[PDB]
Write a structure and sequence with these properties.
This protein has four helices and eight strands. It has 184 residues and is α+β, with helices and mostly antiparallel strands. The radius of gyration is 16 Å and the shape is globular. It starts with a strand and ends with a strand.
């Protein structure tokens, strides 16, 4: 039930908060909003889709950044409550260069920098766009990871009250929550 974090050794001395503030700005905002949607540019994709998946993945339109959201996710499109992403969010993986899809056995990052697993998030359809899953993932699409940061901060303090998003990855490794992965 405890949050698990992976990080490239490159980020060992970063705080989680500082990494996510930079990642949000580096990915930027794909502008998935009325009158701005561009299929194959700023929709992302589900595995296996078309409107539900064990993964939802999106590449930046500003940089090589990409994320993969993992769990059991559902998008309502026009159906009440419209344009809601709901369901279970277990993991967020952040890095560069999205590959794959259903036919490849899933989505993958060429360079996975950081991931957060065992997030334990579950938002029902009835909450619509006010659901935590919706707000966490939409923040990643739109250059504001405040919602994700708050959920990670809460999960860390729940493992041990000395931990927070102001901890470095190396501090979270010493606390048994985080695990170093190979550098790009």
């Amino acid at each position: 039930m405890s949050i698990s974090i992976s990080y490239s050794t490159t980020y060992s001395g970063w705080t989680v908060a500082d990494y996510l503030a930079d990642w949000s700005a580096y990915f930027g905002d794909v502008n998935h909003r009325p009158g701005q949607v561009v299929d194959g540019s700023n929709t992302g994709g589900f595995n296996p889709g078309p409107f539900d998946g064990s993964q939802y993945a999106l590449k930046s339109t500003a940089s090589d950044a990409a994320f993969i959201a993992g769990g059991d996710l559902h998008y309502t499109l026009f159906s009440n409550p419209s344009h809601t992403l709901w369901g279970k969010l277990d993991s967020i993986a952040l890095g560069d260069t999205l590959t794959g899809g259903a036919s490849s056995g899933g989505y993958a990052l060429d360079s996975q920098e950081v991931s957060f697993s065992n997030l334990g998030l579950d938002s029902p359809i009835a909450q619509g766009r006010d659901g935590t899953v919706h707000k966490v993932v939409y923040g990643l699409m739109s250059g504001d990871s405040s919602a994700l940061q708050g959920q990670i901060d809460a999960l860390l303090k729940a493992v041990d009250p000395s931990l927070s998003i102001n901890s470095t990855f190396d501090q979270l490794a010493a606390a048994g929550v985080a695990h170093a992965t190979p550098a790009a």
